[PDB]
Amino acid sequence: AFEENLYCDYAKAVAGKDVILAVFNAAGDKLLAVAGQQGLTVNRSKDSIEITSKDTVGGWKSKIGGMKEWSIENDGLYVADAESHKELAKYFESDSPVCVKIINQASKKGLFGGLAIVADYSFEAPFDEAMTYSVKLDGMGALVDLTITEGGDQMPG
Template structure:
């Protein structure tokens, strides 16, 4: 017996699964007309956004520290199973070796996304004797991330 309709809970959990966040790299020739290529084998992609802390305390603050945000930065820590011939991972490795910045897209589960330019500041290949080979890297932002944009179809998935 096949079912096509299922009841939905009224108090639906708003949590999202980490597996549904994806990292793409622009393998096209321009930023204006990107070719988004998935970095294959992703296990994690941790987006970090920070601001420097500027001390704005003074003698009248009652002994409490006061801070204001300074320069902001972002980075993406990435770990992927190393898939031989994966175009996205190969592009990242080539960019690292050539010392080039990459145009990246960080996609949310609802297909909305942010984009930005980054420098691959770490690119490591781990090859344990008892596990799969993994590619690990850190993409350090070069300027701001874009505002969140609505999802669109990918030219290459």
């Protein structure tokens, strides 16, 4: 086939559109892709503790790792009666943590999951564009790396 793959050979990159943020509803029985989403940022950082002393030799500072924190930023087209946005609205109103999940919907693998505060939930309505939302999810604890953890492959539905 294809002339024995002489000039065409049939994992190299993931399209961003296949990676979506999904939230669980308040009961946990439905996993909801956030409607109209367009941009996704997963932030994970670790603190560095400087432990340089006069015992330190060589002229370089001495550092050790500290504690980790994470946040998720998601923006997109805002539709107020969408079920995921009503869930996010209730989470923001009731001061309740939301279980969030990052999934590759094309490969059907979960990437990250954890409990987040809805730290920011804002909207923009320019007269010449579409109304957009912006949500910030502040991690409350561990962000589980599902790429190196067994399971976590439930798709939104």
